[PDB]
Amino acid sequence: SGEYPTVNEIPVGEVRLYQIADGVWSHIATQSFDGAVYPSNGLIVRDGDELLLIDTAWGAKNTAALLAEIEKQIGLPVTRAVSTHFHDDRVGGVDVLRAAGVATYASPSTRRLAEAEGNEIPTHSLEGLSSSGDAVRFGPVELFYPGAAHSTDNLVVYVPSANVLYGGCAVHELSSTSAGNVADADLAEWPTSVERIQKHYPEAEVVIPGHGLPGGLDLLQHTANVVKAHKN
Ligand SMILES: COc1ncc(-c2c(C(=O)O)[nH]c3c([C@H](C)N4C[C@]5(C[C@@H](CN)C5)OC4=O)cccc23)cc1O
Ligand SMILES: [Zn+2]
Ligand SMILES: [Zn+2]
């Protein structure tokens, strides 16, 4: 009824939307992995009379439910999607999107890693993001490659009209103890990558993590702290 939804409030298979700013929503879904249930976020950004989707809802059935929730709550078509790294919480559901007419995009690095791991593969490659600090425009957002962090390919997304920074899984929520699932992470480079984000987006007003509650710019410093301490 208004606060940001949490893992035990969303059955696996349902999707919630949360209005972040004018023309900006997050999507929240839950999924089982290795016998535990986790929430995860993505983003929806209005692009005129169309929508840009950032990240799937972590699976085919969740992503079908996402599209249905968008139709119910917003009623504009999703025409493009960007996946911010290669893991299933970001690309799982790309096949559903592709068959619903959505053009799916990711960096070449994400596409190669997704293919090598057996995850679903976005159709279109996003050039211009291969060096840390690179930024490109994509409809109503800026895509930024901060360097290796949670994964080597992780992208972040800024919505300049609303000063919304979507950090994806390179950014942790404030209740995060612990650096999340670090299987593919670069703990040594992660603080440097976060510092690049902090330098590039000093006017961010909302910061959305890949999992958990949005907050302000403090999420970035918190993430650096938790990664440094996990390493320690
Ligand atoms: C305590 O809180 C939290 N705990 C954990 C997470 C969390 C994150 C995140 O840290 O982004 N990702 C998760 C994934 C994704 C799909 N996977 C799986 C994978 C293992 C590799 C294959 N061997 C690929 O690497 C990866 O990230 C699954 C399950 C949980 C998470 C988030 C939390 O908030
Ligand atoms: Zn991940
Ligand atoms: Zn994640």
| Three-state SS letters, the chain | CCCCCCHHHCCCCCEEEEEEECCEEEEEEEEEECCEEEEEEEEEEEECCEEEEECCCCCHHHHHHHHHHHHHHCCCCEEEEECCCCCHHHHCCHHHHHHCCCEEEECHHHHHHHHHHCCCCCCEECCCCCCCCCEEEECCEEEECCCCCCCCCCCEEEECCCCEEEEECCCCCCCCCCCCCCCCCCCCCHHHHHHHHHHHCCCCCEEEECCCCCECCHHHHHHHHHHHHHHC
In-domain check, residue 123 = yes
Query: Is 47 flagged in the annotation as binding?
Result: no
Phi-psi region of 73 (alpha: psi -120 to 50; beta: other; left: phi over 0): alpha
Closest CA to 105 of 129, 128, 80: 80
Q: Computed from CA positions of residues 199, 213, 161, 81, in that sequence, does the dihedral angle turn out positive or negative?
A: positive
In-domain check, residue 1 = no
Specify the resolution in Å: 1.3
In-domain check, residue 174 = yes
In-domain check, residue 190 = yes
In-domain check, residue 51 = yes
d(CA 69, CA 37): 21
In-domain check, residue 164 = yes
d(CA 179, CA 169): 10
Q: Whose CA is nearest to atom 1 of ligand 1?
A: 180
Core vs surface per residue 185-221: b (16+ CB within 10 A) or e: bbbebbbebbebbbebbeebebbbbbbbbbbebebbe
Whether the CB of 33 sits within 6 Å of ligand 1: yes
Residues serving a catalytic function are 85, 87, 89, 150, 181
- Residue 232 CB coordination number (10 Å): 6
Of ligand 1's listed atoms, the one at least distance from the Cα of 181 is 10
Q: Phi and psi for 35 in degrees, rounded to 5? A: 85, 15
Q: Which residues have a Cβ under 8 Å from the Cβ of 31 and sit 6 or more positions away?
A: 12, 37, 38, 40, 58, 59, 62, 88, 89
Domain count within the chain: 1
Q: What is the domain range of residue 177?
A: 7-231
Cα angle at 77 between 73 and 78, to 5 degrees?
Answer: 100
d(CA 148, CA 178): 18
Edge-to-edge order in the sheet of strand 78-82: 15-21, 24-33, 36-47, 50-54, 78-82, 103-106, 124-125
In-domain check, residue 2 = no
d(CA 204, CA 164): 6
Q: What are 168's strand-pairing partners?
A: 209
- Residue 17 CB coordination number (10 Å): 18
The domain that contains 13 carries what CATH number? 3.60.15.10
Q: Whose CA is nearest to atom 32 of ligand 1?
A: 180
Q: Are 151 and 114 within 8 A, CB to CB? A: no
Q: Whose CA is nearest to atom 33 of ligand 1?
A: 180
Q: How far does the centroid of ligand 1 lie from the alpha carbon of residue 181, in Å?
A: 4
